[PDB]
Design a protein around this nucleic acid. Structure first.
Ligand SMILES: [Mg+2]
Ligand SMILES: [Mg+2]
Ligand SMILES: [Mg+2]
Ligand SMILES: [Zn+2]
Lengths: 227, 1112, 333, 34, 7, 94, 170
DNA sequence: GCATCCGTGAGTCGAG
DNA sequence: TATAATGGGAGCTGTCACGGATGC
C-alpha cells in the first residue's frame, strides 16, 4: 500500500552518429512498453529528414528504361539515390534541386554533385553509377524535407514531363527496436527495464532523434489543455 | 437470467436416484426396517441361516436378530474419530438333546456400521465409500479350447470363496476328464458315485457321435457307488485314510454341501437357463436318503457333447458379455465378510462346546463375538474395495459411489488383465460408461455406472428401453439385461417422431449391438435418451458429440477434481443435468413440504410448513472435507418467502442456485500469446484475482498427543523452555494458539514440553554450563509447529483430556489437542485449470489488466488460450461452447444444450446475430463509427476470405461475429491483432492440483533407520529420489563426480554428509566421499545369509570398511 | 517458407559452421521472434475454420452407389461374404483418402492461410488424418475383436457424431489407451535390460588397431526381386553419418581417406556416387568389429552425435546406446 | 559408491594436472637447483 | 489415475 | 552457453579432460584465495552487487576464463603432487 | 533419495535464455541454505552460522538482505532439472537459476521436447551440485545450451516447435 | 527328441 | 497333578514367457 519510488537513471551508449543504445531502469510495472511503443512510432514516422522525391535524366522516357553507356539501369540508379543522405544546414530551406553532369570512363560518386548553399552530403563516397567510353549521364534530382515514408505514387511530383517520381524516405531513423526486461529494486519484484536501440543515417544522431521524439510526445500532452 | 434450452428429444422417464445402488443394496442386506419374522432370507439374515444351527450333544440354534440405535450421531462420530454404527443383537437358544433343557438368551454380537443418507460410511471419523465389484457371474459356461480347435471346455463357476471351479474337457484319448483343485480324473467315476448306471448314460447320451464311449469304462460300472466313492476319495486325497464316512463327508462338502458350496441366485438362474433344466438348490448335487443325487453334472456333460458334435442350438459363451458378468454391491461384500466372521464365531462355539461344564451353559458363555467384529472392521478398515471418500466436490462423492472395480479380493490382479478385460464390450451400451475410466494402469478395470443404468436383484446391470408396437412408441419402459437386450431390434433415441409414431421410413437400430437400418414395422424397442449411454460426469460435458472420446475421458475425470470456489458459478452452457447432480448428492438443502420461511440466518433456517410445524434446518458452515476443501451451506432464501415442496432452501458447496458450480465462466480469447501459453500453458488476468474468481478456502487439521512416559509425562503448556514472549504471543493460558490468530511457517500451534532422555553432558556442554552459570532445564521443546509452506488463520481448536467426562483416549495418552487452520487461496501461478472438454493447463503468467488483449469497447478478456491445443486434441466442444458463450455474454443469458441433441450451428448463428446487434448497434447510437484498426483488420480478413468484399464495415464485422470472431486490440501496443480472434465465454474449473501443495525443497533432514538414506515425501521433509534411470542419465553424461556425490555426500554416507555440510558452512570445498552406509548394510545382510563378502585391494589382501569395529 | 524441417536444418548447419554458442544465441533469437510474431499473426480457431469441402458430399454419394453395386454382386452370389466385406472396406479406405485430399486441396487453393492448414503444413500442430477427422469424415472404426465395422462414421467432429457413432469409436479409443498403458511398462523393462547388458561399455582408447570392419550396403534387394534399388536417405544416413572409413574410397574424383569421420555432406556425396553407380557399399569402422576390451575405441565408434564431432574418450557408449533405443520405445505401434 | 570409470572418472583424463606458468617456473627452478 | 494427468 | 565453450572443446583431446582441468584449477583458486590467478586486474570476472561491481565468487568461471588465456599449462605427470602443493603453498600462503 | 533437492510444478518462461531456468526464491533458499548461512556470516546479516539458521527458521524473521545474499550465493552456479521418467540423458539438464517470485519452476521452451515435458501440470525436480568438480561437470557437460543435438539420431533435439514455427511460418 | 512342470518378472514421479 | 479323553484344515481359481530343467 505505502509506496516509495526514486530513480530511474538514463544510460546512453553510442557508436558514432550512426547508432545508439538507451537504457531506462527501474520503471513501474508496465511502464516499460508504455514509454517504448509511442517513442518507436514517433521515431519512425515523425522525425524530420531529407529524401530524393524526384529524378530527371536526359534521353530516358521512364523508370524501367535503360541508359546507353551506363551499366546500371534506371532502376538501380534510383535505388542508390534513395540511400543518399542529405543534410540541410539552414532550417529555413524546404527543398533543393541537385544537378549532376558527367561522362566518359568514370564512376560517379555523391561527391560529383554540384555543391549547393547550406546543403551537406553526409556520404560523398556513396556510389551512384559507372559510365563507360561514350557514356553520358545528365541528371537533376529533387530533394525535399519532410517526415516518414512516402511512396512514389503518393507525392506524384513532377518538375518536368520526364521527371521520375521516387519513393521518398524522409526519416533519418533507419530502425527502432526496444525490449522490456524484468528487473528488481530491493524487494520490488516486477519493475520494468527499458532498452532502446536506434539506427540513423548520420544526418541526425540517435540521441538527437530520441530527444526530438520525447519533445513531440510531450507537446502532444499539452493538447488536453484548453477545450 | 433467461435460460434457453435446445433439443427436440423428450425424456419419458427421469434419472433414477443416483446413489440408489448403495442405499438399496445396504438396506436390502440389513433389513433393519423389516420386522424379524417378515425378513426374506438374504444378506446377514442369510449368513445367520447358513452359520446356524451349530451342533456337537449340545445344540445352539438361531431365532432372529435386531439392530439397535446408533450410540452416536454421524457428526459426533466424525469429530471424535468414531465409527457410525448400530449394535447387533441376536436371539439364540441352547438345546441339550438328551436332557431336553432349553436356555434362550439375546447375545450382543458387537456393532455393524450404518450407511449414511448419501450412501457413504463413517469409519473412525473418516468418510469412506464401498466400491462395487464387477466379476464373472456364476453359472455354467462353455468356451473354445485354445489348444484343440474342435473341442470345448466346460466350466462350472460358483460364487467367490464358495468352493472350487470345475473343468470338464474331452481328452485326446477320448475320455472325459474333470478338474477340481488342479486334479484331473475321469468323470465316469463321479457319475458312478452319483448313482448313474451304464444303461442310463447310454440311453441319455447315445445319440451323440461316439462321445459316449469315452465315458464308458467297465471297471467303474463293476463297482457300487460306495466303492467308486472311496476310489474317488483315494484319488483326491493321497495319504489320507479312505474311511467311508470321511469320504462321504469330503465329497458332500466338496459338491452337495450348501454351507461350503453355493452358486449365486444368478448362477442358479443362468445355469437353469443355459442347460434348460431346473435346480432344487444352489448346489451341483444333493445328499438324499443316504446317497448322492445329481442336480447338474449330467445336463452339463450333455450340453458339452452337444456343442462338440455340432448339434444346433448350442453356443460358446462370451465371458466379457454383461449377461455373463455381474456386480457385487456393498451389501453382498459386507454379507460375505459377515458370513466369514460368523463362521469363525461358529468354530469358537463348537470349541467352547467341547470344553466346559456340560450342565450349565448359556448362549453368552458359548458366544465370543470378537472374530465377527474383527471381520467386519477388517472389511471396512483394510479392504481394497473400501476406499477413502472423495469429498472434493459433490460430484466427486456421487461419482465415487457410482464406481465399478474389476479389481479387489476375488477379482482381477493387475497384469492378469489383457486387452479383453479392459475393452468396451458391445453390451456396455446403456450400462457401463465407455468414456469414463482412469488413464494409466487402471484403464478399463475401473469404470463408472451409466446414468440410466440399474443393477437388478441378481447383480446384473440393466438399461431402460421404450416399447414400440407397430411403429408407435409407448411410454411403457422396460429395463433389460444384456441377454434380454440381444433378443430385440432397438431404435436410436434421435429417430424422428410425429406424436407417438415413427416419422422415418428408414430407422437406425441395433441388433445384438450391430448397427442396422430397419423399417418401423421391425422396430421392437427404442432408446430412452442419449444420456443413458454415459456416466453422470460424462453427461456434464456440453457438445460432447464434437469432442474426441479420449479428450472426453479427461474432461469427465477432471470434473471430479474441481475445487469448490467461494464465487463459483454454474456453466453458461449446460447439459441440463446440473440440478439433479446437486440434488442427489445431498449438497443443497431443500423444502420438505410447502410453507412459509420463518427465520433466515447464516447458521440456520427455520421453516413453517402447512402442518403448522416449525422445522429448523441447521447449516453446515466451513466444515473440512476429506481432501481439505471447504464444505459450507449458504441460505438462498429470505424471511417470509413462500416456498413449495422441493424448493431450494440453502446452497451447498460448489452449487449456484441449485445448479452445479465447478468453476467460473470467464471471457476467453484463443490466440498464441508471447509463448506464455506455449504447450498448454495458460495466461490469466489479474482482474480475476481482483474480483476473487477462482478463490477457494482450504482447511488443514493438525494433531498432537501428550502421553505418559517412563521418563516423566509430556504436557501441553504455555511454558516453553528458551522461548521469547514474541513466539508465545498468540498462545493462550493453556498453551494453545488462539482462534483468529494468523499462523506462518515456524509458528507454534500447540506448546508442548517433554522430559529429556537421560543426558550425560559432553564436556563442552559442562564447560559452557559453568561459563553461563545456568542449570540445564529438565524438559525440552516438542511443540507442534507450522510445517514449511503452510499456514493460515486458526478457526477451531479441539482439546480432549483424560479424566474428563465423555473422554477416554488410547492407553498412555494423557491428552490430545487438534488445531484447525483455514486459508483463503487465490489463483496463482502453477495452479491447474481445465475445462469440460479435456483441455487442461497450468497458469503460466498473470498479466496486469492493461497488458490484456481487449475488445474495441475496452473490455479486457479474462483468459488467453493457445489454439495449438485444439487441432491435435480434436475437441471442438470448447469452440462451440466459446461461441455460444460469446452470444450469451451480450444477450445476458445461459443455455441448456443436452448431449447429442442440442444447439446447432445455424441457431447459434441466430443468437450471435442477436448478440451482434447489442454489441455493435449500441455503438452507432453512441455517436461512434468504425475504427481505423477495425478497417485494417477487415482488410486482412477480406484477404483471408472470412468476409465478402464490397460489404459495409458493419456487415463484415457482423460476418466475423457470426463466425465467433471479433476484432481484438493488443493491450501493450494499441494496435489490433492482424487477424480477427475467436472470443467468448467458457466454463473453466480450478482443479485440486495446486502448486502450493506441491512445491517442496530440502537441504538436509531426517534419514531412514536401516538404510540411513533421506526419507520420502513432503510431510517427512524428504529428498527427491534419484533412481536407476537418473543414475543412467548421469552416467551417459559422463559426470562421475556429480553421480558419486549423489550416492555418497548428499545421502547415505554419514561421515560424508556431516563433513560436507560442515565444510560448506565453513566456506570450504567438500571433502572426498567415503563408503556409503547401505553398502555396509548389504555386506552384513549377506553375512546373515552365510555369505562372506570381502573387499580387497589389488594385492588380494582384505580391506576392512567397518574399520575394525566388526572384527574381534 | 520456414517450417519445422527447414528450421531444423538451419539449426544443424548453424551448429556445424558457427558452433554451439552462436547456435544457442540463434535459438533464443528464433524463440523470441517466433513467439512475438505468432502473437499478432491473428491465428485462432473458430468452428468455421474447419472447412468441409463440397467434394466430400459427392464422394459420399458415389460411395453409396458403389456399395449398392457390391451389394447387388452379393445378392446374385458373385461375391462371398468375406469378399464383399473386403471390397466395402477397401472402398471406404479409398473414399477416406479421397476426402482427405479434397480437404487439403480445398485448403491449399482456396484458403491457404487457414489456421488448421497453417498449423498442419508448418509442423506446429496436427497431421493430415486429424485434420481429416475435423473437416472430412471420421472414417472406419474397429470392433473390440479388431474386426472393422462395415459402417464408417460419416460425421466430422465439426458436424458432430451420432450416439451410435461415438459408442462405436469408444472401442478404438479404449483399445488405444490400454495399448499405451501396457506399452509403457514393457518399453521401460526393455530399456532397463539394454542398460544392464551394455552398462560396462565405455570408450577406453583412441584406437584398438583392428583391421576388421563392416560394409554398409547403399543398395537393397527389391520385393519384386527384379534388381537392387537404392535404400532410403534416412536409413543410409543412420548407417553412415559420423562413422570412420576403414578403407580408401575414391568416388566422383573425390578422395575419402582411410580414417575419415564422415560428415553429413560426405554421406550425401556417397549417395550421389551410388546413384552414379560408382560404389554399392561403404566399408566402415564398427563397434561390431572393435577389438577394444570392455568397450569400444574412438575410431570404431566415430562421431559423438550430440557434438557432431569425434567422440571423446571416456564417454559411456553403452548407456547412451541403451537410452537411445529405449526412449522411442513408448512410441512403437 | 565409487567414481565410475567413465567421463571425468576415466583413467585417461582423470590424472591430468593444471599449473600456472609462475608456479611451473618456480618448480622448474627447484628442479634446476638439485 | 496416471498417463498425462484426466486422473 | 559458457563463453568460448567451442574453443575450450578445441583445446583438449577429450571433452572430459577439459572438465578435470577446469575443476582442479578452480580448487587451486579456492584453496589459495585467488592470489594465484593468471588474470590481470582488468580481466577479472565481475559480479554486479547492490553496491557495485565486485570479484566473481565463482571459481569455475575464473578457471574457464583463465584457461581461455593460454596462460595455463595442463597435461599428465607435469610435476610430483606434493611438490606442486608445497610450491604453491610457498608462493601463495593460505 | 538425496539431499539438496526439491520439486515443483513447471511453467514456461519465454524470457529465459536457453541456459537459464526460473527457480522459486524459497526453494533456492532451502537448497543453497548452508551456502546462504556462510554468506550471511560473511556479511553483517548474522553474528554466526547458528544465529543465521535460527533467523531463517521463522518466515517472519526473514528480511530483504538475505535475498540479495542469496543472489550473491547462486551466482555463476547451475542446478539440475529432471523430469520423470528419464528416458535418456537429456532427461536431466543443467540450468543457471534465476530467482523468481512464485512457487513454480520456470522452464525454457526449447528443452521441453527433450524432456517430453508440457505445461498441463507436469512437475520437475531440482538438484544442487555441491563440489566445484560436480559444478564444473554440470556446466561443461550437462548444460542445456551445450547439448543441441540428439545423441541417438545426431539431429537437433533442440529446435523451434509449436508457437515458434507458427510465427516464423507466418 | 518332444511334452510338461516350476520359478521368476512384469516403466518412472508424486502421495497413501 | 489322576473319570476318560488318542491322524488338521483351508484351498479360491480371467498373464506369459521365455527358459531351464525334468519327466515320459
Ligand atoms: Mg515487469
Ligand atoms: Mg503433461
Ligand atoms: Mg502433451
Ligand atoms: Zn575399435
Amino acid at each position: 500500500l505505502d509506496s516509495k519510488l526514486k530513480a530511474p537513471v538514463f544510460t546512453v551508449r553510442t557508436q558514432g552518429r550512426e547508432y545508439g543504445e538507451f537504457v531506462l531502469e527501474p520503471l513501474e510495472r508496465g511502464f516499460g512498453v508504455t514509454l517504448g511503443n509511442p517513442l518507436r512510432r514517433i521515431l519512425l514516422s515523425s522525425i524530420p529528414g531529407t529524401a530524393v522525391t524526384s529524378v530527371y535524366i536526359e534521353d530516358v522516357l521512364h523508370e524501367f528504361s535503360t541508359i546507353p553507356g551506363v551499366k546500371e539501369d534506371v532502376v538501380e540508379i534510383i535505388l542508390n539515390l534513395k540511400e543518399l543522405v542529405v543534410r540541410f544546414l539552414n532550417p529555413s530551406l524546404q527543398t533543393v534541386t541537385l544537378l549532376l553532369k558527367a561522362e566518359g570512363p568514370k564512376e560517379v560518386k555523391a561527391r560529383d554533385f554540384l555543391p549547393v548553399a547550406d546543403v551537406e552530403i553526409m556520404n560523398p563516397d556513396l556510389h551512384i553509377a559507372t559510365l563507360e567510353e561514350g557514356g553520358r549521364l545528365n541528371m537533376e534530382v529533387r530533394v525535399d524535407r519532410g517526415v516518414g515514408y512516402v511512396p512514389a505514387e503518393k507525392h506524384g511530383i513532377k518538375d518536368r514531363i520526364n521527371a521520375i517520381p521516387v519513393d521518398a524516405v524522409f526519416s533519418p531513423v533507419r530502425r527502432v527496436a526496444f525490449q522490456v526486461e524484468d528487473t528488481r529494486l530491493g524487494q520490488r519484484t516486477d519493475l520494468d527495464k527499458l532498452t532502446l536501440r536506434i539506427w540513423t543515417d548520420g544526418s541526425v544522431t540517435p540521441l538527437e532523434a530520441l530527444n526530438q521524439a520525447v519533445e513531440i510526445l510531450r507537446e502532444h500532452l499539452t493538447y488536453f489543455s484548453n477545450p | 437470467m433467461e435460460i434457453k434450452r435446445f433439443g427436440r428429444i423428450r425424456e419419458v422417464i427421469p434419472l433414477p436416484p443416483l446413489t440408489e445402488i448403495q442405499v438399496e443394496s445396504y438396506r436390502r442386506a440389513l433389513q433393519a426396517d423389516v420386522p424379524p419374522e417378515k425378513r426374506e432370507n438374504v444378506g446377514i439374515q442369510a449368513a445367520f441361516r447358513e452359520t446356524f444351527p451349530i451342533e456337537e450333544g449340545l445344540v445352539l440354534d438361531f431365532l432372529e436378530y435386531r439392530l439397535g440405535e446408533p450410540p452416536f450421531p454421524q457428526d459426533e462420530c466424525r469429530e471424535k474419530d468414531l465409527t457410525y454404527q448400530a449394535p447387533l443383537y441376536a436371539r439364540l437358544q441352547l438345546i441339550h438333546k438328551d436332557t431336553g433343557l432349553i436356555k434362550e438368551d439375546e447375545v450382543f454380537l458387537g456393532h455393524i456400521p450404518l450407511m449414511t443418507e448419501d450412501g457413504s460410511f463413517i469409519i473412525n471419523g473418516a468418510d469412506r465409500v464401498i466400491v462395487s465389484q464387477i466379476h464373472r457371474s456364476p453359472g455354467v459356461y462353455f468356451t473354445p479350447d485354445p489348444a484343440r480347435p474342435g473341442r470345448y471346455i466346460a466350466s462350472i463357476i460358483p460364487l467367490p470363496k464358495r468352493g472350487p471351479w470345475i473343468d470338464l474337457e474331452v481328452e485326446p484319448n477320448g475320455v472325459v476328464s474333470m478338474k477340481v483343485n488342479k486334479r484331473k480324473f475321469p468323470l465316469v467315476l463321479l457319475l458312478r458315485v452319483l448313482g448313474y448306471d451304464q444303461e442310463t448314460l447310454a440311453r441319455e447320451l447315445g445319440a451323440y457321435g461316439e462321445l459316449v464311449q469315452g465315458l464308458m469304462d467297465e471297471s467303474v460300472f463293476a463297482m457300487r457307488p460306495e466303492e467308486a466313492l472311496i476310489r474317488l476319495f483315494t484319488l483326491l486325497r493321497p495319504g489320507d485314510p479312505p474311511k467311508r464316512d470321511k469320504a462321504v463327508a469330503y465329497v458332500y462338502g466338496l459338491i452337495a454341501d450348501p454351507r461350503r458350496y453355493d452358486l449365486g441366485e444368478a448362477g442358479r438362474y443362468k445355469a437353469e437357463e443355459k442347460l434348460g433344466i431346473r435346480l432344487s438348490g444352489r448346489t451341483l448335487a444333493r445328499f438324499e436318503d443316504g446317497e448322492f443325487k445329481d442336480e447338474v453334472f449330467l445336463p452339463t456333460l450333455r450340453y458339452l457333447f452337444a456343442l462338440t458334435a455340432g448339434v444346433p442350438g448350442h453356443e460358446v459363451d462370451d465371458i466379457d458379455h454383461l449377461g455373463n458378468r455381474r456386480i457385487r454391491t456393498v451389501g453382498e461384500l459386507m454379507t460375505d465378510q459377515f458370513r466369514v466372521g460368523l463362521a469363525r464365531l461358529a468354530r469358537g462355539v463348537r470349541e467352547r462346546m467341547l470344553m466346559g461344564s456340560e450342565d450349565s451353559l448359556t448362549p453368552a458363555k458359548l458366544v465370543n463375538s470378537r472374530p465377527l467384529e474383527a471381520a467386519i472392521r477388517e472389511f471396512f478398515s483394510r479392504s481394497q474395495l473400501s476406499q477413502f471418500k472423495d469429498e472434493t466436490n459433490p460430484l466427486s462423492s456421487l461419482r465415487h459411489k457410482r464406481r465399478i472395480s474389476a479389481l479387489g479380493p476375488g477379482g482381477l490382479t493387475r497384469e492378469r488383465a489383457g486387452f479383453d478385460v479392459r475393452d468396451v464390450h458391445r453390451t456396455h451400451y446403456g450400462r457401463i460408461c465407455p468414456v469414463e475410466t482412469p488413464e494409466g494402469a487402471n484403464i478399463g478395470l475401473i469404470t463408472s455406472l451409466a446414468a440410466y443404468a440399474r443393477v437388478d436383484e441378481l447383480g446384473f446391470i440393466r438399461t431402460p428401453y421404450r416399447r414400440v408396437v407397430g411403429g408407435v412408441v409407448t411410454d411403457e419402459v422396460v429395463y433389460m439385461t444384456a441377454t434380454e437386450e440381444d433378443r430385440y431390434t432397438i431404435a436410436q433415441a434421435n429417430t424422428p417422431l410425429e406424436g407417438n409414431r415413427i416419422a422415418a421410413e428408414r430407422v437406425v437400430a441395433r441388433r445384438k449391438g450391430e448397427p442396422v437400418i430397419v423399417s418401423p414395422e421391425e422396430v421392437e424397442f427404442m432408446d430412452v435418451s442419449p444420456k443413458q449411454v454415459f456416466s453422470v460426469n460424462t453427461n456434464l460435458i456440453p457438445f460432447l458429440e464434437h469432442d474426441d472420446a479420449n479428450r472426453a475421458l479427461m474432461g469427465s475425470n477432471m470434473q471430479t477434481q474441481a475445487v469448490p470456489l467461494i464465487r463459483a458459478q454454474a456453466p453458461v452452457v449446460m447439459t441440463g443435468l446440473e440440478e439433479r447432480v446437486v440434488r442427489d448428492s445431498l449438497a443443497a438443502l431443500y423444502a420438505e413440504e410447502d410453507g412459509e420461511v420463518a427465520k433466515v440466518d447464516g447458521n440456520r433456517i427455520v421453516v413453517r410448513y402447512e402442518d403448522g410445524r416449525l422445522v429448523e434446518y441447521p447449516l453446515r458452515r466451513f466444515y473440512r472435507s476429506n481432501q481439505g476443501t471447504a464444505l459450507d451451506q449458504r441460505p438462498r432464501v429470505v424471511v417470509g418467502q413462500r416456498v413449495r415442496k422441493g424448493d431450494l432452501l440453502a446452497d451447498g458447496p460448489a452449487s449456484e442456485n441449485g445448479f452445479l458450480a465447478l468453476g467460473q465462466n470467464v471471457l476467453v480469447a484463443i490466440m498464441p500469446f508471447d509463448g506464455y501459453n506455449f504447450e498448454d500453458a495458460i495466461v490469466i488476468s489479474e482482474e480475476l484475482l481482483k474480483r476473487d474468481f477462482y478463490t477457494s478456502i482450504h482447511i488443514e487439521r493438525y494433531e498432537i498427543e501428550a502421553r505418559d512416559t517412563k521418563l516423566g509425562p509430556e504436557r501441553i503448556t504455555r511454558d516453553i523452555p528458551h522461548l521469547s514472549e514474541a513466539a508465545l504471543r498468540d498462545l493462550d493460558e493453556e498453551g494453545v494458539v488462539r482462534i483468529g490468530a494468523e499462523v506462518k511457517p515456524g509458528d507454534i500451534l500447540v506448546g508442548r514440553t517433554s522430559f529429556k532422555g537421560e543426558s550425560e553432558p559432553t564436556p563442552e556442554e559442562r564447560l559452557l554450563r559453568s561459563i553461563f552459570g545456568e542449570k540445564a532445564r529438565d524438559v525440552k521443546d516438542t511443540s507442534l509447529r507450522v510445517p514449511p509452506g503452510e499456514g493460515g488463520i486458526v478457526v477451531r481448536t479441539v482439546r480432549l483430556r483424560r479424566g474428563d467426562p465423555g473422554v477416554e483416549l488410547k492407553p498412555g495418552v494423557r491428552e490430545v489437542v487438534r488445531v484447525y487452520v483455514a486459508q483463503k487461496r487465490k489463483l496463482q501461478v502453477g495452479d491447474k485449470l481445465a475445462n469440460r472438454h479435456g483441455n487442461k493447463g497450468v497458469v503460466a503468467k498473470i498479466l496486469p489488466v492493461e497488458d490484456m488483449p481487449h475488445l474495441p469497447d475496452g473490455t479486457p478478456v479474462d483468459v488467453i488460450l493457445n489454439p495449438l491445443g485444439v487441432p491435435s486434441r480434436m475437441n471442438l466442444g470448447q469452440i462451440l461452447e466459446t461461441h455460444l458463450g460469446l452470444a450469451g455474454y451480450f444477450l445476458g443469458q445461459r443455455y441448456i444444450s443436452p448431449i447429442f441433441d442440442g444447439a446447432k450451428e445455424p441457431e447459434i448463428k441466430e443468437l450471435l446475430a442477436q448478440a451482434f446487434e447489442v454489441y455493435f448497434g449500441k455503438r452507432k447510437g453512441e455517436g461512434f463509427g468504425v475504427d481505423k484498426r477495425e478497417v485494417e483488420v477487415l482488410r486482412r480478413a477480406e484477404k483471408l476470405g472470412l468476409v465478402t468484399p464490397g460489404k459495409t464495415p458493419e456487415e463484415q464485422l457482423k460476418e466475423l461475429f457470426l463466425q465467433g470472431k471479433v476484432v481484438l486490440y493488443d493491450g501493450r501496443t494499441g494496435e489490433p491483432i492482424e487477424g480477427p480472434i475467436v472470443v467468448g465465454q467458457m466454463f473453466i474449473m480450478k482443479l485440486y492440483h495446486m502448486v502450493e501443495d506441491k512445491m517442496h525443497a530440502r537441504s538436509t533432514g531426517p534419514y531412514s533407520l536401516i538404510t540411513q538414506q533421506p526419507l520420502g515425501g513432503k510431510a517427512q521433509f524428504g529428498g527427491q529420489r534419484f533412481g536407476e534411470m537418473e543414475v543412467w542419465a548421469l552416467e551417459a553424461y559422463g559426470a562421475a563426480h556429480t553421480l558419486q556425490e549423489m550416492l555418497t555426500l548428499k545421502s547415505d554416507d554419514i561421515e560424508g554428509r556431516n563433513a560436507a555440510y560442515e565444510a560448506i558452512i565453513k566456506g570450504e570445498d567438500v571433502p572426498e566421499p567415503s563408503v556409503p552406509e547401505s553398502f555396509r548394510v548389504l555386506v552384513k545382510e549377506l553375512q546373515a545369509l552365510a555369505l562372506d563378502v570381502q573387499t580387497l585391494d589389488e594385492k588380494d589382501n582384505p580391506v576392512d570398511i567397518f574399520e575394525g569395529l566388526a572384527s574381534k | 517458407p520456414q517450417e519445422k524441417n527447414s528450421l531444423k536444418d538451419l539449426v544443424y548447419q548453424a551448429f556445424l559452421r558457427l558452433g554451439m554458442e552462436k547456435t544457442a544465441r540463434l535459438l533464443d533469437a528464433l524463440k523470441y521472434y517466433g513467439f512475438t510474431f505468432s502473437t499478432t499473426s491473428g491465428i485462432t480457431i473458430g468452428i468455421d475454420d474447419a472447412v468441409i469441402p463440397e467434394e466430400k458430399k459427392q464422394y459420399l454419394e458415389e460411395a453409396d452407389r458403389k456399395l449398392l453395386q457390391i451389394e447387388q454382386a452379393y445378392e446374385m452370389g458373385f461375391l462371398t461374404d468375406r469378399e464383399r466385406y473386403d471390397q466395402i472396406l477397401q472402398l471406404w479406405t479409398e473414399t477416406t483418402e479421397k476426402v482427405t485430399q479434397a480437404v487439403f486441396k480445398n485448403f491449399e487453393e482456396n484458403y491457404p492461410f487457414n489456421p488448421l492448414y497453417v498449423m498442419a503444413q508448418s509442423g506446429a500442430r496436427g497431421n493430415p488424418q486429424q485434420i481429416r477427422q475435423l473437416c472430412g469424415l471420421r472414417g472406419l472404426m474397429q470392433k473390440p475383436s479388431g474386426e472393422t465395422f462395415e459402417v464408417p462414421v460419416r460425421s466430422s467432429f465439426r458436424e458432430g457424431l451420432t450416439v451410435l457413432e461415438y459408442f462405436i469409436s469408444s472401442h478404438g479409443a479404449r483399445k488405444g489407451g490400454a495399448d499405451t498403458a501396457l506399452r509403457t511398462a514393457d518399453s521401460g523393462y526393455l530399456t532397463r535390460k539394454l542398460v544392464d547388458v551394455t552398462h560396462e561399455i565405455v570408450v577406453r582408447e583412441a584406437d584398438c588397431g583392428t583391421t576388421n570392419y563392416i560394409s554398409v550396403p547403399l543398395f537393397q534387394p527389391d520385393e519384386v526381386t527384379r534388381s537392387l534399388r537404392l535404400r532410403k536417405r534416412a536409413d543410409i544416413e543412420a548407417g553412415l553419418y559420423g562413422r570412420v572409413l576403414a578403407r580408401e574410397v575414391e568416388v566422383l574424383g573425390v578422395r575419402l581417406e582411410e580414417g575419415r569421420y564422415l560428415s553429413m555432406d560426405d554421406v550425401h556425396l556417397l549417395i550421389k556416387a551410388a546413384e552414379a553407380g560408382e560404389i554399392q557399399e561403404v566399408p566402415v569402422r564398427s563397434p561390431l568389429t572393435c577389438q577394444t576390451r570392455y568397450g569400444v575405441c574412438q575410431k570404431c565408434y566415430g562421431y559423438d552425435l550430440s557434438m557432431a564431432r569425434p567422440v571423446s574418450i571416456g564417454e559411456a557408449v553403452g548407456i547412451v546406446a541403451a537410452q537411445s533405443i529405449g526412449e522411442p520405445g513408448t512410441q512403437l505401434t | 559408491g565409487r567414481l565410475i570409470p567413465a567421463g571425468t572418472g576415466s583413467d585417461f583424463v582423470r590424472f591430468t594436472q593444471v599449473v600456472d606458468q609462475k608456479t611451473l617456473k618456480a618448480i622448474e627452478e627447484a628442479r634446476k637447483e638439485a | 489415475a496416471x498417463x498425462x494427468x484426466x486422473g | 552457453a559458457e563463453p568460448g565453450i567451442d574453443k575450450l572443446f578445441g583445446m583438449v583431446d577429450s571433452k572430459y579432460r577439459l572438465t578435470v582441468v577446469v575443476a582442479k584449477r578452480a580448487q587451486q583458486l579456492l584453496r589459495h584465495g585467488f592470489k594465484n590467478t593468471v588474470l590481470e586486474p582488468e580481466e577479472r570476472p565481475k559480479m554486479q552487487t547492490l553496491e557495485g561491481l565486485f570479484d566473481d565468487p565463482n571459481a569455475v568461471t575464473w578457471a574457464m576464463k583463465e584457461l581461455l588465456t593460454g596462460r595455463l599449462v595442463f597435461g599428465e605427470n607435469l610435476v610430483p603432487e606434493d611438490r606442486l602443493q608445497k610450491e604453491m603453498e610457498r608462493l601463495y600462503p593460505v | 533419495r538425496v539431499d539438496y533437492s526439491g520439486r515443483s510444478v513447471i511453467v514456461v518462461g519465454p524470457q529465459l535464455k536457453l541456459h537459464q531456468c526460473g527457480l522459486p526464491k524459497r526453494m533456492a533458499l532451502e537448497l543453497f541454505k548452508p551456502f546462504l548461512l556462510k554468506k550471511m556470516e560473511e556479511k553483517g546479516i548474522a553474528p554466526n552460522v547458528k544465529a543465521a539458521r535460527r533467523m531463517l527458521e521463522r518466515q517472519r524473521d526473514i528480511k530483504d538482505e538475505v535475498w540479495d545474499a542469496l543472489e550473491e550465493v547462486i551466482h555463476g552456479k547451475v542446478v539440475l532439472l529432471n523430469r520423470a521418467p528419464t528416458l535418456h540423458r537429456l532427461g536431466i539438464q543443467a540450468f543457471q537459476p534465476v530467482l523468481v517470485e512464485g512457487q513454480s519452476i520456470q522452464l525454457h521452451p526449447l528443452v521441453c521436447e527433450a524432456f517430453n515435458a508440457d505445461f498441463d501440470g507436469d512437475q520437475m525436480a531440482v538438484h544442487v551440485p555441491l563440489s566445484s568438480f560436480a559444478q564444473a561437470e554440470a556446466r561443461i557437460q550437462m548444460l542445456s545450451a551445450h547439448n543441441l543435438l540428439s545423441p541417438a539420431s545426431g539431429e537437433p533435439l533442440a529446435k523451434p516447435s509449436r508457437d515458434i514455427i507458427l510465427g516464423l511460418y507466418y
